[PDB]
Enzyme design. Structure first.
Site, PDB file in Angstrom:
ATOM      1  N   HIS A  41     -42.703  17.300 -65.342  1.00 45.60           N
ATOM      2  CA  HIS A  41     -43.225  15.934 -65.392  1.00 45.60           C
ATOM      3  C   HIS A  41     -44.418  15.772 -64.472  1.00 45.60           C
ATOM      4  O   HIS A  41     -44.284  15.147 -63.402  1.00 45.60           O
ATOM      5  CB  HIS A  41     -42.135  14.915 -65.025  1.00 45.60           C
ATOM      6  CG  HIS A  41     -41.055  14.843 -66.061  1.00 45.60           C
ATOM      7  ND1 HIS A  41     -39.736  14.619 -65.769  1.00 45.60           N
ATOM      8  CD2 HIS A  41     -41.154  14.932 -67.472  1.00 45.60           C
ATOM      9  CE1 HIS A  41     -39.030  14.576 -66.955  1.00 45.60           C
ATOM     10  NE2 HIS A  41     -39.908  14.750 -67.983  1.00 45.60           N
ATOM     11  N   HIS A  74     -36.518  21.154 -68.085  1.00 51.02           N
ATOM     12  CA  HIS A  74     -35.413  20.219 -67.995  1.00 51.02           C
ATOM     13  C   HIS A  74     -34.253  20.567 -68.868  1.00 51.02           C
ATOM     14  O   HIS A  74     -33.157  20.103 -68.577  1.00 51.02           O
ATOM     15  CB  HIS A  74     -35.900  18.799 -68.406  1.00 51.02           C
ATOM     16  CG  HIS A  74     -37.209  18.467 -67.786  1.00 51.02           C
ATOM     17  ND1 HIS A  74     -38.350  18.745 -68.417  1.00 51.02           N
ATOM     18  CD2 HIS A  74     -37.552  17.978 -66.511  1.00 51.02           C
ATOM     19  CE1 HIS A  74     -39.422  18.382 -67.634  1.00 51.02           C
ATOM     20  NE2 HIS A  74     -38.931  17.954 -66.446  1.00 51.02           N
ATOM     21  N   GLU A 126     -33.100  15.762 -68.707  1.00 53.76           N
ATOM     22  CA  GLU A 126     -32.106  16.736 -68.174  1.00 53.76           C
ATOM     23  C   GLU A 126     -30.681  16.234 -68.482  1.00 53.76           C
ATOM     24  O   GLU A 126     -29.823  17.036 -68.843  1.00 53.76           O
ATOM     25  CB  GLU A 126     -32.295  16.882 -66.687  1.00 53.76           C
ATOM     26  CG  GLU A 126     -31.510  18.071 -66.167  1.00 53.76           C
ATOM     27  CD  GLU A 126     -31.281  17.961 -64.678  1.00 53.76           C
ATOM     28  OE1 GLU A 126     -30.164  18.307 -64.280  1.00 53.76           O
ATOM     29  OE2 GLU A 126     -32.226  17.511 -63.926  1.00 53.76           O
ATOM     30  N   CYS A 197     -30.129  20.674 -56.725  1.00 54.77           N
ATOM     31  CA  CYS A 197     -30.646  21.999 -56.382  1.00 54.77           C
ATOM     32  C   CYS A 197     -31.244  22.093 -54.992  1.00 54.77           C
ATOM     33  O   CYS A 197     -31.472  21.089 -54.345  1.00 54.77           O
ATOM     34  CB  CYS A 197     -31.682  22.477 -57.401  1.00 54.77           C
ATOM     35  SG  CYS A 197     -33.250  21.535 -57.283  1.00 54.77           S
ATOM     36  N   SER A 226     -38.556  12.259 -61.788  1.00 49.14           N
ATOM     37  CA  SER A 226     -37.415  11.709 -61.078  1.00 49.14           C
ATOM     38  C   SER A 226     -37.383  12.153 -59.609  1.00 49.14           C
ATOM     39  O   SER A 226     -37.170  11.327 -58.736  1.00 49.14           O
ATOM     40  CB  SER A 226     -36.174  12.220 -61.823  1.00 49.14           C
ATOM     41  OG  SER A 226     -35.099  11.510 -61.320  1.00 49.14           O
ATOM     42  N   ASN A 227     -37.510  13.463 -59.405  1.00 41.31           N
ATOM     43  CA  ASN A 227     -37.329  13.941 -58.025  1.00 41.31           C
ATOM     44  C   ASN A 227     -38.437  13.367 -57.155  1.00 41.31           C
ATOM     45  O   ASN A 227     -38.160  13.121 -55.926  1.00 41.31           O
ATOM     46  CB  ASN A 227     -37.299  15.466 -58.064  1.00 41.31           C
ATOM     47  CG  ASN A 227     -38.725  16.109 -58.110  1.00 41.31           C
ATOM     48  OD1 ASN A 227     -39.399  16.309 -57.077  1.00 41.31           O
ATOM     49  ND2 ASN A 227     -39.178  16.362 -59.299  1.00 41.31           N
TER      50      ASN A 227
HETATM   51  C1  LIG Z   1     -37.345  20.669 -64.514  1.00 42.68           C
HETATM   52  C2  LIG Z   1     -36.998  19.684 -63.468  1.00 42.68           C
HETATM   53  C3  LIG Z   1     -37.632  19.236 -62.399  1.00 42.68           C
HETATM   54  C4  LIG Z   1     -38.963  19.524 -61.854  1.00 42.68           C
HETATM   55  O1  LIG Z   1     -39.588  18.236 -61.576  1.00 42.68           O
HETATM   56  P1  LIG Z   1     -39.988  17.223 -62.817  1.00 42.68           P
HETATM   57  O2  LIG Z   1     -40.823  16.157 -62.157  1.00 42.68           O
HETATM   58  O3  LIG Z   1     -40.602  17.962 -63.944  1.00 42.68           O
HETATM   59  O4  LIG Z   1     -38.629  16.626 -63.391  1.00 42.68           O
HETATM   60  P2  LIG Z   1     -37.647  15.485 -62.873  1.00 42.68           P
HETATM   61  O5  LIG Z   1     -37.600  15.379 -61.361  1.00 42.68           O
HETATM   62  O6  LIG Z   1     -36.286  15.970 -63.433  1.00 42.68           O
HETATM   63  O7  LIG Z   1     -38.073  14.248 -63.598  1.00 42.68           O
HETATM   64  C5  LIG Z   1     -35.630  19.103 -63.799  1.00 42.68           C
HETATM   65  S1  LIG Z   1     -34.568  20.401 -63.309  1.00 42.68           S
HETATM   66  S1  SF4 Z   2     -36.082  20.795 -59.425  1.00 47.71           S
HETATM   67 FE1  SF4 Z   2     -34.450  22.384 -59.047  1.00 47.71          FE
HETATM   68  S2  SF4 Z   2     -33.249  22.556 -60.942  1.00 47.71           S
HETATM   69 FE2  SF4 Z   2     -35.247  21.535 -61.443  1.00 47.71          FE
HETATM   70  S3  SF4 Z   2     -36.802  23.182 -61.992  1.00 47.71           S
HETATM   71 FE3  SF4 Z   2     -36.979  22.887 -59.803  1.00 47.71          FE
HETATM   72  S4  SF4 Z   2     -35.551  24.460 -58.887  1.00 47.71           S
HETATM   73 FE4  SF4 Z   2     -34.920  24.145 -61.028  1.00 47.71          FE
END
Ligand SMILES: C/C(=C\COP(=O)(O)OP(=O)(O)O)CS
Ligand code: SF4
EC number: 1.17.7.4
Length: 309
Positions: A41, A74, A126, A197, A226-227
């Site tokens: 994302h 995801h 996810e 994680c 999200s993260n």
């Molecule tokens: C692939 C993932 C996270 C890496 O960060 P992102 O910003 O692409 O995704 P989210 O934090 O799940 O929205 C979900 S494990």
């Molecule tokens: S945020 Fe964690 S679970 Fe998601 S891609 Fe990165 S290491 Fe993998």
């Protein structure tokens, strides 16, 4: 104005692997490479890959016969995987290994017809992918987001019950949801703590340390990350002003006027170049040399599959 950088910040192992999978596929097979969902994302990563010929789609029915399709980091439901599998598509899977680990547990409970509860946010890919590993009608798969959601859930057999989590949640909020689950369902089984994680845990710890020192925290990351939103929320709950920004253009000068200490972090899907440009704009607005905070060392790397070296 002093500029502090959070450590760790920025790409995790799953994101670095997923981006390399799409790049290497583009290099090996040429455009177009189809990708189901934004691979990670992050607008800058996704716009880049689009301009090199990746096409991002939501549904497999958008992809042509004979194409190469990559699933995003995801993960995807079994239904999506089976729908790709029954089409004439060459598939590569960029799902992060740490998401695949949770998917296998959900699949194991399904095979047993034992109910499972996922802690996560409705509608996020996810969560769709993980809920999507459960298919046994005898059992059940339930989503809860908060303690109140736990307080209202009823299940068929609370004696055979397990829980799993999304990998990018708030460590602190998820802790409260698990305490609720164990009070309502004393026999529930789960991992020792949760399925959040290392990278989400580490970036939250690093932002807590950053916000102790900084009056204002900028988190580089896209609005649908999200993260990245959890890191901004964490700093905001500590009483600091905190902003989620895609790039340095988004910085409003009022946010840092007469601020003595500004902190910068980056979510797990944000490239370091965006952090460098943010630091350069803070310098334009008065800040000095960026100072990295001491932080927990990360050492995990996930390799691309050999078919894509
Ligand atoms: C692939 C993932 C996270 C890496 O960060 P992102 O910003 O692409 O995704 P989210 O934090 O799940 O929205 C979900 S494990
Ligand atoms: S945020 Fe964690 S679970 Fe998601 S891609 Fe990165 S290491 Fe993998």
């Amino acid at each position: 104005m002093q500029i502090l950088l959070a450590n760790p910040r920025g790409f995790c192992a799953g994101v670095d692997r997923a981006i390399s999978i799409v790049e290497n596929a583009l290099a090996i097979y040429g455009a177009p490479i189809y990708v189901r969902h934004e691979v990670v994302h992050n607008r800058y990563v996704v716009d880049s890959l689009r301009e090199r010929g990746a096409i991002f789609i939501e549904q497999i029915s958008e992809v042509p016969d004979g194409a190469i399709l990559i699933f995003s980091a995801h993960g995807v439901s079994q239904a999506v995987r089976n729908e790709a599998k029954s089409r004439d598509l060459t598939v590569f899977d960029a799902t992060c290994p740490l998401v695949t680990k949770v998917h296998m547990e959900v699949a194991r409970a399904s095979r047993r017809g034992e109910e499972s509860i996922l802690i996560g946010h409705a509608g996020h890919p996810e969560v769709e992918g993980t809920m999507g590993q459960y298919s046994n009608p005898e059992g059940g798969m339930y989503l809860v987001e908060s303690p109140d959601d736990v307080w209202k859930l009823t299940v068929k057999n609370e004696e055979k019950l397990s829980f799993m989590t999304q990998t990018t949640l708030s460590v602190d909020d998820t802790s409260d949801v698990i305490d609720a689950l164990r009070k309502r369902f004393p026999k529930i089984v789960g991992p020792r703590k949760d399925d959040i994680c290392y990278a989400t845990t580490n970036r939250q710890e690093a932002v807590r340390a950053l916000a102790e020192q900084a009056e204002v925290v900028l988190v580089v990351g896209s609005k649908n990350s999200s993260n990245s939103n959890r890191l901004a929320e964490l700093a905001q709950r500590m009483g600091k002003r905190a902003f989620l920004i895609d790039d340095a253009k988004d910085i409003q000068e009022e946010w840092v006027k007469e601020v003595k200490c500004v902190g910068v972090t980056a979510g797990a899907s944000a490239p370091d170049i965006l952090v460098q440009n943010v630091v350069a704009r803070l310098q334009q607005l008065g800040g000095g040399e960026a100072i990295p905070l001491e932080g927990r060392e990360e050492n995990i790397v996930f390799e691309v599959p050999k078919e894509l070296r």
